[PDB]
């Protein structure tokens, strides 16, 4: 059974590559990651960094989340990501994403002993 922090791996972990988004990363990527098998997952992040580098998000700048907890934290360095996001003609089953690398801080919403991240909560 998935927990959270595996979840969260699976949904938002990509450290195979730098950036290095083809136009069509986003199409496969939530494919392959189970993020179209329900709906169309609308919006996605990947981060392309270390495991060790986004675990340790948990122990930097503590901000509020969105849903006005108290648990979430922001990089203090930008990392590489990508945005994947439903392109108007996209229809379940057939989800089309655009695809948008960027270097932006992440902020992530931790739980757990050990503390580790379940939520992606923004880009900034
Ligand atoms: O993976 C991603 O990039 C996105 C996944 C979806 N989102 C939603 C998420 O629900 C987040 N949000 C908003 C309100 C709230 O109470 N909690 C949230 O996580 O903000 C985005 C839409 O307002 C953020 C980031
Ligand atoms: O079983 C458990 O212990 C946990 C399973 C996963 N979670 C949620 C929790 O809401 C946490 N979360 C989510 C959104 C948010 O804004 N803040 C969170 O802490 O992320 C997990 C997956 O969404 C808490 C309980």
Redesign the pocket.
């Known amino acids: 059974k998935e927990?959270?922090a595996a979840?969260?791996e699976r949904q938002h972990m990509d450290s195979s590559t730098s950036a290095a988004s083809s136009s069509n990363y986003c199409n496969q990527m939530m494919k392959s990651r189970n993020l179209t098998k329900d709906r169309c997952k609308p919006v996605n992040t990947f981060v392309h960094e270390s495991l060790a580098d986004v675990q340790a998000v948990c122990s930097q700048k503590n901000v509020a989340?969105?849903?006005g907890?108290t648990?979430?934290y922001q990089s203090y360095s930008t990392m590489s990501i990508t945005d994947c996001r439903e392109t108007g003609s996209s229809k379940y089953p057939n989800c089309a994403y655009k695809t948008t690398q960027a270097n932006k801080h992440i902020i992530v919403?931790?739980?757990?002993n050990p503390y580790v991240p379940?939520?992606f909560?923004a880009s900034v």
């Open positions: 927990t959270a979840k969260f989340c969105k849903n907890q648990n979430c919403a931790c739980e757990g379940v939520h909560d």
